[PDB]
C-alpha cells in the first residue's frame, strides 16, 4: 500500500514511442511533400467474447504442439506434470534399412523378428504409436547401463504406469537395434514436456512443449490437480552434470548417446548432460568422460543440444514420482533444440 | 658463485674443450657449472667435518 521510495515501484507495480510513432506518421495528412506555400451461463459468454476481444486487441517464450497416439507404449496418465516424451518415429518399417549397413554377419533378421513381437501385443490404423516418454527410454537401457535402484526405480515406474511384456519386448528391440547399427537414436528424438494428455480409451492426444520454459505452462499447484510443472531428467544418475570444476555462468544442456560396439554386449546409454562449455568444446570433454571407444568397434557418443539453462540451483533430491524415483530437476531450462552432432 | 647444492659454479676458460691442450690459451674466461657427483663434495664450510 504505497512505498517511501516511489520511483522503484511504478516500474515494479507495472509504447509511448508507438504513440509518438503514429503521431508524426499517421496523424500526418494529404502530404508528405506537402502542397506548396443467463445468470452466470449468459454472463459467461460475453466475457469469453471479452477475452477474444482482448486477445484480438494485441498481437515467444515457447512453441506448443499436440499429437494423437496410443497408450501401448508411453502413457500420459502414469506420467505427470513435468516429463520428457521422446518421439519414436517411422517404426512402420521392420526395418528394411537394418539390412543395409549392419556389417555382416549380424543377422539382420533379428529386428524384424524382435519388433513384430512388440507389435503383436502392443497394425497401422489411424493412431500411430509414437511418443515414448524420455523417462520411458531410460528404463529400456536402464538395466544394461548406469547402475541400480536408480535406473531400476525409473523402469518400475514405466511398467507400473503404462506391462512387463512390452518392457521386455521393447528391451528386446533395444538390444536388437543396438545390435544391427540402427541405434535407439536415429529414432526417438525429443518431443516436449507433457502439458496435457486428454486420453480416451486406447487413444491419447498429448499436448507437450516444443520449446520454451516449462514452469510457465498450465501451472497452478499442478497443471490442473497434478503434482505441478517441472523439467526433471529421469535419472538421478541417468542424467549427468560434467562441471566437475566450474564457475557461475549459463549452462548448456545436451543429449548424449553412447554405445558399446559389442565390447560389452552392445549396450546403449542416453544421458542428459549439463555443462557450461559450448557444443564446440563438448566433444573433447565427452571424450574424456566416456570411454565406449573400447570396441577394438568404431564411432559413438553422438550428442545434440537440448537447450540452454541460465538458472543453476534447482536440482533437488526428490524421490517422489509417478512408485517414487529420485529425479534431478533443473529450473529455468529454455529450449534451443540444436541438431545431432555425434560422429 | 655458490648457488645450487648440486653444482659447482666456477670460472674456467670459454673454449677449452676437454680434454685438450697442455696449458689453456688462457683467454676471456666464463663461468661453468659441473655436477657435484656426491654429497661429500659439498664445501666443508657448508657441511662441516
Amino acid at each position: 500500500t504505497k512505498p517511501l521510495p516511489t520511483a522503484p515501484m511504478a516500474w515494479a507495480e507495472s509504447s509511448p514511442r508507438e504513440l509518438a510513432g503514429h503521431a508524426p506518421l499517421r496523424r500526418v495528412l494529404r502530404p508528405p511533400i506537402a502542397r506548396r506555400d443467463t445468470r452466470a451461463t449468459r454472463d459467461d459468454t460475453e466475457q469469453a467474447v471479452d477475452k477474444i476481444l482482448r486477445g484480438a486487441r494485441r498481437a515467444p517464450r515457447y512453441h506448443l504442439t499436440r499429437q494423437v497416439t496410443l497408450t501401448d507404449l508411453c502413457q500420459p496418465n502414469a506420467e505427470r506434470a513435468g516429463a520428457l516424451l521422446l518421439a519414436l518415429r517411422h517404426p512402420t518399417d521392420l526395418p528394411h534399412l537394418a539390412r543395409h549397413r549392419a556389417p555382416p554377419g549380424r543377422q539382420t533378421e533379428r529386428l524384424a523378428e524382435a519388433w513384430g513381437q512388440l507389435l503383436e501385443a502392443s497394425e497401422s490404423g489411424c493412431a500411430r504409436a509414437g511418443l515414448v516418454s524420455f523417462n520411458f527410454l531410460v528404463a529400456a537401457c536402464t538395466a544394461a547401463y548406469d547402475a541400480r535402484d536408480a535406473a531400476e526405480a525409473v523402469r518400475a515406474h514405466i511398467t507400473t504406469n503404462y506391462a512387463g511384456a512390452r518392457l521386455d519386448r521393447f528391451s528386446e528391440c533395444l538390444r536388437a537395434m543396438v545390435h544391427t547399427h540402427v541405434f535407439p537414436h536415429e529414432v526417438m528424438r525429443f518431443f516436449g514436456g507433457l502439458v496435457s494428455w486428454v486420453t480416451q480409451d486406447e487413444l491419447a492426444s498429448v499436448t507437450a512443449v516444443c520449446s520454451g520454459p516449462q514452469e510457465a505452462t498450465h501451472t497452478g499447484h499442478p497443471g490442473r490437480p497434478c503434482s505441478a510443472v517441472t523439467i526433471p531428467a529421469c535419472a538421478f544418475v541417468d542424467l549427468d552434470a560434467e562441471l566437475c570444476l566450474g564457475g557461475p555462468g549459463a549452462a548448456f544442456l545436451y543429449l548424449v548417446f553412447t554405445y558399446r560396439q559389442c565390447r560389452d554386449q552392445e549396450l546403449c546409454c542416453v544421458y542428459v548432460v549439463k555443462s557450461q562449455l559450448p557444443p564446440r568444446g563438448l566433444e573433447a570433454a565427452l571424450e574424456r568422460l566416456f570411454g565406449r571407444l573400447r570396441i577394438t568397434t568404431c564411432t559413438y557418443a553422438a550428442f545434440a543440444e537440448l537447450g540452454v539453462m541460465p538458472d543453476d540451483s534447482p536440482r533437488c533430491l526428490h524421490r517422489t514420482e509417478r512408485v517414487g524415483v529420485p529425479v534431478v530437476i533443473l529450473e529455468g531450462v529454455v529450449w534451443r533444440p540444436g541438431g545431432w552432432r555425434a560422429c | 658463485l655458490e648457488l645450487h647444492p648440486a653444482f659447482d659454479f666456477f670460472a674456467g676458460v670459454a673454449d677449452v674443450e676437454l680434454p685438450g691442450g697442455e696449458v689453456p690459451p688462457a683467454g676471456p674466461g666464463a663461468i661453468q657449472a659441473t655436477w657435484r657427483v656426491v654429497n661429500g663434495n659439498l664445501p666443508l664450510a657448508l657441511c662441516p667435518v
Binding site: P310, E331, V334 | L3, L46
Partner: protein, 343 residues
Amino acid sequence: SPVALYHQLKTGLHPGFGFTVVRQDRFVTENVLFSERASEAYFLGQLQVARHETGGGVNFTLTQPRGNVDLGVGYTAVAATATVRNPVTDMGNLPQNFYLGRGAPPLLDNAAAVYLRNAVVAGNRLGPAQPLPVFGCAQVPRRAGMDHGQDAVCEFIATPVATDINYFRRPCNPRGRAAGGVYAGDKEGDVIALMYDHGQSDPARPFAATANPWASQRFSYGDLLYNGAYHLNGASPVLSPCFKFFTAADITAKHRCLERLIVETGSAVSTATAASDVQFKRPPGCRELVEDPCGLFQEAYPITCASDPALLRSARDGEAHARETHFTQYLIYDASPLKGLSL
C-alpha cells in the same frame, strides 16, 4: 641426483644438507574499528531499475551509484585485532609436490622419468589424480573426509646444515637475506641491490651476506624454484608459501613509503583461498582482504618446534625450562604474533 636422493631420504640417510620449511597459515581474527566522526563523505546516486526476460521470470535488478572520499588530512579509522577466533588451516604436515606443474625439462631417460615420477606421485595427498591435462588443472585428489581444517602446504628450501639455528630463532626472512622494500635506501635500485648484491651485507644481519647462499642469491637454486618469474610451478593449483619471498619482481613492484604500507597491510588480498580442502592459489575473480604482516616486514615467524619429542615435551610451560639444545638436537620456541595466546 634426484633419483639417488629418493633412496636416501626414503631410507633415512641424511643427505648432506637440510631444508627450511615455510608454510603459510590462515586465521580468523576479531577486530574493532574506531572510525572518527566524519571520516569520509559519501555521495548517494539515483536508483535506475533494469529489467530483462529470463528462464521463468522477469527479474528487475535495482542499482544505485555511490562515491566517497576520506575527509581529513591524516589517519582516521584504525582497526585492531583483538583475539583469534580459530586457525582455519590444519596448521600441519603436508608437503609440496612439484609434479602438479610443469616448469622443468624432464630427465632424458624416459624410463627414469616415469620411475621417479610415480615413486613420488604414488600416494601423495597432493599427488595428481590421473595425468596432467594439457589445458586444465592438476586435479588434486579429493579425500572423502576431513577434520581439522584446510591443509596447509609446506615448502622446503634446501639450506646448508651449517646455518646457525639462531637465524631461525627470530622472525627472519626464509630466503637467507632481507628482501623488503621497507629496508630500502631511497635511491633508484635500492631493492635488488639490497637483496642479491652479495658483495654487500644483509640489512637484518649486517655482519653477513646471507644465511642460505642457495636461496638469497639471484639464479641460485631456491631462486630458480620459488621465484615466480620462472614459473616452475604454475599449472600447479596449490599455493606456494615461498612465492611471496622469492619474487624480486613483486618485491620491487611495491613502493617504500611506510605511510601507505601500513594501511595496505590491514587489507591485503590474500594469495590463498580458505574455500578449498587443500590451500590453493587464489583463483582470479575473488579476493580475501587478509591482514598479512609478512608481506610488509618481509618475514616468517618461528613456531615452537623441536627435533625431539623430549625437547618439545620440555617446552609446555613457558620457555622457562624449555631445553633449547642437547647434543645434536635443538629446540626453537615460538616467536610470532600468536605467542601468549592459547589456541
